[PDB]
């Protein structure tokens, strides 16, 4: 049942988690999720725009 995961590094290891409760709502924080896709907000265009090319041709 024990999960061993990497800690966030400090000034200068791993840590252990066991879930004690039958509901996932009881669990501690979700693990770090570094997912991102800024383009859905910063570049939501139909036709691909190549930076080095003219935006309008």
């Amino acid at each position: 049942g024990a999960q061993v995961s990497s800690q966030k590094v400090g000034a200068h290891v791993n840590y252990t988690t066991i879930n004690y409760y039958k509901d996932s709502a009881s669990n501690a924080a979700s693990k770090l999720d570094f997912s991102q896709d800024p383009s859905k907000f910063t570049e939501p265009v139909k036709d691909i725009m190549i930076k080095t090319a003219p935006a309008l041709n």
Partner: protein
Amino acid sequence: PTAQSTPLTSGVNSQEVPALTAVETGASGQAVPSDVIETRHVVNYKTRSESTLESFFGRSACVTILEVENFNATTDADRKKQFTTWAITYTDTVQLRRKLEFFTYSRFDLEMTFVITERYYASNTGHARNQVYQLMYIPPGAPRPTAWDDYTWQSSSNPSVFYTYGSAPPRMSIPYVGIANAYSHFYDGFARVPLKDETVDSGDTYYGLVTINDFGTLAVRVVNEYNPARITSKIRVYMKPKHVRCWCPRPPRAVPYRGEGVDFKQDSITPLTAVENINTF
């Protein structure tokens, strides 16, 4: 995963022009420093760990302050001070609300924590034995108390927590309880369609989330009967969203709130302080 490193680049003399674009397209500017200056190589070991949604929301925030008392009540008004009820919401305070309102929709479990404090009302009426509090979650439809010692507090089905004064702040988790597939922080609509020639009032009806939201009621009492010394208590309620997802970002609140809606106040709609000149460093 780390934020972007910078590559070694020199100059250019080229028909490739990454410095120019056309934001009419709806795309933001995309150019980075290596597109417009000579750059050295810099390895970036830094991460965006603390700006993930879980990190941004990973705090218990105070959302309200409730009051309850324990004393010999001989009037209706004083009897109503022996318990309190509160419609569960995040709009009594501004800080967590503003953070949530960076988004249109969210989905999360909730950690609720409480801080309970007391003081003596006066010093010429003896003392008071240590008090136990009951905090009862009343889902929509369940009977609400009309007295601090009525039958509703037996709480056969509603969740209650009994807290003993001086003990660690009590705490429980709540699942994502929305009846939709996410919570809505904004709802551009009404609870019913008013129809042609109906006699239902249309002059005093409301608009938006207030017409459709109902997260039930928190009821709080001191379980003890009265002492000669009147004790007054505050219950601070804290919320931490966890296991968080959010959708559809929004500009953040720029001016003071004046209630549960998006309404603004005429004396408080000038957030910017004017600069002396457009050329002010």
